[PDB]
């Protein structure tokens, strides 16, 4: 989409691996705000919004928290307390044509600045102080939007760049998009420290002979002693007995 017409989307309710990205491309522009890129794949978020668009080469710097410019102050603005991050990778093999790709535009003239995540599409002819040259030309009737017009003879500063902006939320988050997990391969017949989806304990694991009902996840003897657990991977029932101890 264009800079001023990004295609908003939400990405929630999923076990999100933020490291599947790294196998895609060289990731020319990859810096994360509010969250470290290294510690991204694990952290959890409320709602992850995605804005996709294309800009020129020397204007990718204006997409930053609190940064003023001509694409940031006129047609796309992200907060200063922004949590998420922006990812821009030069793409002039699918976006720059010979003669000028007049498909990506950018608000060059406007009235004031825009609020964070404020997208506008209006393509009216800008005023001229007085009544403008509505549908005509003249002294100063300058359209607010201007096309980039990418071509394969432009320098890297004038080449199209695809860019995705991810907006996270960390305040009150109903963890819905995050967590890669790590099911440490199972060990049996040795008293081992176990953590089954939060249930932590120690003991010897043995093949079970009791029929857990399909909606049950735990087993208990008298006095709430956790006696058994079902595998979250293979759904097999296992018996827990505390490893041997005694007096000498």
């Amino acid at each position, epitope marked *: 989409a264009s800079v001023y017409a990004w295609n908003r989307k939400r990405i929630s309710n999923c076990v999100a691996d933020y490291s599947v990205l790294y196998n895609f491309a060289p990731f020319f522009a990859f810096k994360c705000y509010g969250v470290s890129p290294t510690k991204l794949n694990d952290l959890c978020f409320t709602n992850v919004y995605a804005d996709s668009f294309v800009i020129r080469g020397n204007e990718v710097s204006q997409i930053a928290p609190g940064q003023t410019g001509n694409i940031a*102050d*006129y047609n796309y603005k992200l907060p200063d307390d922004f949590t998420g991050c922006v990812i821009a990778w030069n793409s002039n093999k699918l976006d720059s044509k010979v003669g000028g790709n007049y498909n990506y535009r950018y608000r060059l*003239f406007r009235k004031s600045n825009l609020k964070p995540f404020e997208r506008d599409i209006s393509t009216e002819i800008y005023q001229a*102080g007085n009544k403008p040259c509505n549908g005509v030309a003249g002294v*100063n009737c300058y359209f607010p939007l201007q096309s980039y017009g990418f071509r394969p003879t432009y*320098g890297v500063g004038h080449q199209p760049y695809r860019v995705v902006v991810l907006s996270f939320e960390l305040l009150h988050a109903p963890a819905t998009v995050c967590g890669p997990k790590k099911s440490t391969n199972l060990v049996k017949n040795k008293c081992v420290n176990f953590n089954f989806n939060g249930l932590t304990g120690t003991g010897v694991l043995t093949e079970s002979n009791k029929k857990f009902l399909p909606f049950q996840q735990f087993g208990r003897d008298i006095a709430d002693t956790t006696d058994a657990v079902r595998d979250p991977q293979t759904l097999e029932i296992l018996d827990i007995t505390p490893c041997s101890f005694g007096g000498v």
Partner: antibody, heavy 118, light 109 residues
Framework: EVQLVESGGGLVQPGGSLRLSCAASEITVSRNYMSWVRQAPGKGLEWVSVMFAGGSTFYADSVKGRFTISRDNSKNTLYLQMNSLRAEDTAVYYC????????????WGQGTLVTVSS | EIVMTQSPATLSVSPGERATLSCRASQSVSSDLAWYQQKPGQAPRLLIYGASTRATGIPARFSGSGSGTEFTLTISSLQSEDSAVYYCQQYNNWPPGYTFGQGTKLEIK
């Protein structure tokens, strides 16, 4: 007629301050990319500063940190404050409304001489 | 900061003929240019913007051409009052940017 008229030109002792002013007519400045240009006697021209229509301004490197552009939008006029005038900054300053890719700089100002004691 | 170099410095042509002035860039300036005629004594005047588009009013007698790293301005028939200075201003980076030349002095007889 459409014009840019300037004021503030004169003489001041080094290290002193100054203020250049730019008046317009039949055209607004607040919402117009404004650009002050200057010319040293006998030399070329150089882009000095620019203010946008949202307020985010910019300045050249040679004068960064010493000059400050402003405009009384209420009465449709432009200004450029200068300080710490050194031997180089002696030049004639022009006011311009630059558009860029959609029509290059056109409308200019009568200019204003800025010299130093010596 | 792309440095532009004009050439030649001076030109003296009999009245009524053509004149050809080159201004040379050091990088890709594609079609982002303009030509100003600053008659001696006041502010410059825009003649030809973009690549070769003739500014309003500006007599057709002027003609601009070129693209990339090399550009040229051409005048059909110099009249006695055409003597002035000309500068090619590039703007490949518009917010904030422009780059002027050293100017060229053209006269007649």
């Amino acid at each position: 007629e459409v014009q840019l008229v300037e004021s503030g030109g004169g003489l001041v002792q080094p290290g002193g301050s100054l203020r250049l002013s730019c008046a317009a007519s039949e055209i607004t400045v607040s919402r117009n990319y404004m650009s002050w240009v200057r010319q040293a006697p006998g030399k070329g021209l150089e882009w000095v500063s620019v203010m946008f229509a949202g307020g985010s301004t910019f300045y050249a490197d040679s004068v960064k940190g010493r000059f400050t552009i402003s405009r009384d939008n209420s009465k449709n006029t432009l200004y450029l404050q200068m300080n710490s005038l050194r031997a180089e900054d002696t030049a004639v300053y022009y006011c311009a409304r630059d558009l860029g890719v959609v029509g290059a700089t056109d409308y200019w100002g009568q200019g204003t001489l800025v010299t130093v004691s010596s | 900061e792309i440095v532009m170099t004009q050439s030649p410095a001076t030109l003296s042509v009999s009245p009524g003929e053509r004149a050809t002035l080159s201004c040379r860039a050091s990088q890709s300036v594609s079609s982002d240019l303009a030509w100003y005629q600053q008659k001696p004594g006041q502010a410059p005047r825009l003649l030809i913007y973009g690549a070769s588009t003739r500014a309003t009013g500006i007599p057709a007698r002027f003609s601009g051409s070129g693209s990339g790293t090399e550009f040229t301005l051409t005048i059909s028939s110099l009249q006695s009052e055409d003597s002035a200075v000309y500068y090619c201003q590039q703007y490949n980076n518009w917010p904030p940017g422009y780059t002027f030349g050293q100017g060229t002095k053209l006269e007649i007889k």
